[PDB]
Paper text:
An alignment of the ApoL1-NTD with the corresponding NTD of ApoL2 (N2-T113) showed that the Ab6D12 epitope, including the important R105 residue (R46 in ApoL2) is highly conserved. The complex superimposed well with that of the Fab6D12:ApoL1-NTD complex, displaying a virtually identical four-helix core structure (rmsd of 0.5 Å for 319 atoms) with almost identical helical boundaries as found in the ApoL1 structures. Similarly, the four N-terminal residues (N2–S5) are disordered. However, helix 4 is not further extended as seen in the Fab6D12:ApoL1-NTD complex, but this entire segment (H62–T113) is disordered, due to differences in crystal packing. The epitope conformation is fully preserved and Fab6D12 engages in similar interactions with ApoL2-NTD as seen with ApoL1-NTD, including the key interaction of the R46 residue (R105 in ApoL1) with the acidic pocket of Fab6D12 (electron density in Supplementary Fig. 2e). The only amino acid change in the epitope is residue D47, which nonetheless forms an H-bond with the Fab CDR-L3 N92 residue as does the corresponding N106 residue in ApoL1. These results demonstrate that ApoL1 and ApoL2 share the exact same four-helix conformation of their NTDs.
Apolipoprotein L1 (ApoL1) is a circulating innate immunity protein protecting against trypanosome infection. However, two ApoL1 coding variants are associated with a highly increased risk of chronic kidney disease. Here we present X-ray and NMR structures of the N-terminal domain (NTD) of ApoL1 and of its closest relative ApoL2. The NTDs of both ApoL1 and ApoL2 adopt the same fold composed of four amphipathic helices, which is a conformation unique to members of the ApoL family and clearly distinct from the previously reported colicin fold.
Author numbering:
A (entry chain L): 1 to 212
B (entry chain H): 1 to 136, 142 to 222
C (entry chain A): 6 to 62
Write the structure that this text describes.
Amino acid sequence: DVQITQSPSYLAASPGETITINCRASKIISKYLAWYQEKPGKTIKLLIYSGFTLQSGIPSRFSGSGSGTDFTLTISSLEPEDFAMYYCQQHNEYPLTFGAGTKLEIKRTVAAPSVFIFPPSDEQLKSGTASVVCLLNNFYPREAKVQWKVDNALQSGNSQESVTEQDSKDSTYSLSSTLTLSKADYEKHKVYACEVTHQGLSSPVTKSFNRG
Amino acid sequence: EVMLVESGGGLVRPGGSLKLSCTASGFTFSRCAMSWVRQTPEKRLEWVSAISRDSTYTYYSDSVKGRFTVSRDNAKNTLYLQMSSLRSEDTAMYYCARQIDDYYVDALDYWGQGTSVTVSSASTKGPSVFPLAPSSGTAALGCLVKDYFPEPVTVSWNSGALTSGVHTFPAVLQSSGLYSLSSVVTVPSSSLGTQTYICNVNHKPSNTKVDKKVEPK
Amino acid sequence: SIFIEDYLKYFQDQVSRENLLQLLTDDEAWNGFVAAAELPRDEADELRKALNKLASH
């Protein structure tokens, strides 16, 4: 199997800028690398194949280069329709292998989140479980750290995170983190806190509550 | 106009079997090599299998060899993927794709819309809907749609009359094998009390429609 | 690679120039050979360049 190392995973750009996605192979593949565009809703589209052959119908601003081991996909003067998911693929041999992907996202000014903590509902506690939800609303960029603490004991392995797609209106993100606990252990402890770290915040923000 | 339509996807138990099929049009199917690609829930693309122009050669990836078998019928313009000994790892969206005809192995110039396959022991279950009540000049509230199976669930606010400020999060698969999701809305703190907020949760697979009123306290 | 050198020693010592030129001239035969051998496309390019250098001599 030929392994493909595609970088960067995420790329923030503005329309009219020129960007480059990199793609490295574990062994020599000559010019045999393809690039794909994936947008939400539409089918996966072939942009380039054999390193630099532009597929019919694709705009000239998409330009592929390299041979042997290192390749680059360049998008010059970015159009609003180009903010999507890009994948490289080697078509030198079977098994056909893919790079991990590059999400090309819209750059905007830094926006700090508004943090909200929600204790478990009484309806949910009545049914044997406990969910503490910590919301980070409309922030930018995506890099954010959320740390749950129960009686100052840093939690781990019992929470899950979900993040929205960059908002269509204001190019911002939102994040939901849920700490799930047995109703038995939720009652063992008193203080529940989520500490948030984001570049838009001067120092890390804590939101907490006392059970009852 | 090239057209690739896949079907036969669904829900299967670990160890089970399933037969995906793909009908093609707008081109002479008998002159083309076809590939099967799958996209996982973590969004990784993974090549599965490929069959040659006239079924002479078949190719499979390491994870799938010995369980899956690719085949085609050029008279009926169809391509098939018989799957067996299914694993939770095979949960993905499956695409039949056409290869470029410059070499026996080549880039995929046409892809179909996809067919979803889910391998899981869990049984169809409707969600429990709990409120995320406010107070702790802008307020945040929502509801937690927990322990449902399978996807999807739809969430609207005030029967679709509340669009601005709404964020419905992608679902998350829990250690239990059931999905969990959140929907939140940010509103003016003055509107708390004077206006009611209800999330309308709908889960078609379990024929479950729920209306939960979210209010302070 | 060593496999290209094995194809070279095999094509020199065991294949007639009439049979080798029937392969390099006919793309139907060539495609059937590389698919049968399951050659990566870059080695199939190297081998075809190498067999053209050998056949002309």
